[PDB]
């Protein structure tokens, strides 16, 4: 019984149905996420053949213990819904609100955050999972540990090397081949969204709001940004997918060198 193991609190987040909670067994803070069956896009089968939302399949595949992706602790099926018990770091703030309040981030801080997101996305891919909705809204900052967590696998898919023709992530983070042709490959689409995210961090908001900007191929910098950072962003935002860097090329890029540790990041920029 779910009503027995957890103390449920008020709504959580910053739209959706995620509630604050505490696990009674040990007062562990949790996030209790409800997903209505009639609203589920993709379904998956578990090992025992039980039909679950794909989000549960993907969360189980990444739930090893690497701290950069949100951990699914448990889940329950109800007549009309599924309930996901997720870890809840505290104190946290999502990266969207963090950037809103602080404006464009110092490049040392953006480098630390971007590096952690890259490591989290690599973990997903290594576990066979494509997130498909990388954006600042889906990134939580543990303000005491300086550790970022990727959340909300509700738009994700199993990672494959063939073409994707479906998409339900965030359009202003989606790549021009999706806008133009309704198709994309997983890794190069992820790199595009990471380019959007990095611009967001160093400029204080995303570069594109309209389809014509997404496909237009021009990146205007509204804030002072180093030449090395600009180059990496423009490379991630290459119009042709095959022109975009691999994850290895991103992390070997000159702008990415000498990253801060999470604890250094917390002490320098968050405390």
């Amino acid at each position: 019984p779910l009503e027995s193991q957890y103390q449920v609190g008020p709504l959580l987040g910053s739209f959706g149905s995620v509630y604050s909670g505490i696990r009674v067994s040990d007062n562990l803070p949790v996030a209790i996420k409800h997903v209505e069956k009639d609203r589920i896009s993709d379904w998956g089968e578990l090992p025992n053949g039980t039909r679950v939302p794909m989000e549960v399949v993907l969360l189980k595949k990444v739930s090893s213990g690497f701290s950069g992706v949100i951990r699914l602790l448990d889940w329950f099926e109800r007549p009309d819904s599924f309930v996901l018990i997720l870890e809840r770091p505290e104190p946290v703030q999502d990266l969207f609100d963090f950037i809103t309040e602080r404006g464009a981030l110092q490049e040392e801080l953006a480098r630390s955050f971007f590096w952690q997101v890259l490591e989290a996305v690599r973990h997903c891919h290594n576990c066979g999972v494509l997130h498909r909705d990388i954006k600042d809204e889906n990134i939580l900052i543990d303000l005491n540990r300086g550790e970022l967590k990727l959340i909300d696998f509700g738009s994700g898919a199993l990672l494959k090397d063939t073409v994707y023709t479906d998409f339900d992530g965030t359009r202003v983070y989606s790549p021009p081949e999706w806008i133009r042709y309704h198709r994309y490959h997983g890794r190069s689409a992820a790199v595009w969204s990471l380019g959007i995210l990095l611009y967001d961090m160093v400029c204080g908001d995303i570069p594109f709001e309209h389809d014509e900007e997404i496909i237009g191929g021009q990146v205007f910098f509204r804030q002072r940004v180093s030449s090395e950072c600009q180059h990496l962003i423009r490379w991630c935002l290459a119009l042709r997918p095959s022109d975009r860097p691999t994850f290895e090329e991103i992390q070997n890029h000159p702008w990415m060198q000498d990253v801060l540790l999470p604890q250094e990041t917390a002490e320098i920029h968050l405390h």
Binding site: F96, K135, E137, G154, T170, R171, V172
Partner: peptide
């Protein structure tokens, strides 16, 4: 200028 969230 207006910064906003974007639904999925």
């Amino acid at each position: 200028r207006k910064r906003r969230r974007h639904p999925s």
